[PDB]
Write a protein that binds this ligand. Structure first.
Ligand SMILES: O=S(=O)(O)O[C@H]1[C@@H](O)[C@@H](CO)O[C@@H](O[C@H]2[C@H](O)[C@@H](O)[C@H](O)O[C@@H]2CO)[C@@H]1O
Length: 138
């Protein structure tokens, strides 16, 4: 469902992941949470074009890709962490031509350049772990 979807969330992306297409994830980080992930995925159990992994322990926002069975290099740099314990967040993820463009609460969070080149192949949004979702628009 679009409203209060229970985690783990599986929502399929109509026509594949198109360019110009924005996904909205509004949610809540529990105080007793350590890790959650947002996965843009080729098939229900395949390649992860974009893996996004807020980790509360060290307060990192880990971006990576899982391609051909292996994790590439992590990108960690941010100017802010909206996923602090007990915080609500409003994420806007836009699939661009050369990058994903990611905003949290209206503030730019990260860009992640496509490594899975043909980003169209992505057909599965996957959210898992320590997060409470209030609204998910694909
Ligand atoms: O969903 S999982 O693939 O099972 O979880 C892993 C992912 O979040 C990837 C993304 O890069 O990280 C894996 O672990 C890392 C960890 O970030 C790093 O600190 C450590 O030194 O290397 C790992 C790989 O062995 C997660 O397990």
């Amino acid at each position: 469902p679009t409203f209060n979807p229970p985690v783990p969330y599986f929502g399929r992306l109509q026509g594949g992941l198109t360019a110009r297409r924005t996904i909205i994830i509004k949610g809540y980080v529990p105080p007793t949470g350590k890790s959650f992930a947002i996965n843009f995925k080729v098939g229900s159990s395949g390649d992860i074009a974009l893996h996004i992994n807020p980790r509360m322990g060290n307060g990192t926002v880990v971006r990576n890709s899982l391609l051909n069975g292996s994790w590439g290099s992590e990108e960690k740099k941010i100017t802010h962490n909206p996923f602090g314990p007990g915080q609500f967040f409003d994420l806007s993820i836009r699939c661009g031509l050369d990058r994903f463009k990611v905003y949290a609460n209206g503030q730019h969070l990260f860009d992640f350049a496509h490594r899975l080149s043909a980003f169209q192949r992505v057909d599965t949004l996957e959210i898992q772990g320590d997060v409470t979702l209030s609204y998910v628009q694909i």
